[PDB]
Amino acid sequence: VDCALDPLSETKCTLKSFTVEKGIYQTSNFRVQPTESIVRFPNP
């Protein structure tokens, strides 16, 4: 099984079974990627 194919695949990856019982499985986190980057060096 792939560990990042589908959420079920990752749950199998973490609890380490293909016969996984019924329950809430926190796997990992997520933080939304930076939609944009702004840089302003101090501004004759």
Partner 1 sequence: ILPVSMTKTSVDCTMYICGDSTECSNLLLQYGSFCTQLKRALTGIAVE
Residue type, 24: I
Q: Which of 26, 35, 40, 44 binds partner 1 (CB under 8 A)?
A: 26
C-beta of 38 vs 44, nearer to partner 1: 38
Read off φ and ψ for residue 34, nearest 5 degrees.
Answer: -60, 110
Q: Give min distance, CB of 30 to partner 1, in A.
A: 9
> Using CA atoms, how far apart are residues 6 and 13, in angstroms rounded to an integer?
10
16 near partner 1, rule: CB under 8 A: no
37 near partner 1, rule: CB under 8 A: no
Q: 7: which 2 tokens? A: 């959420």
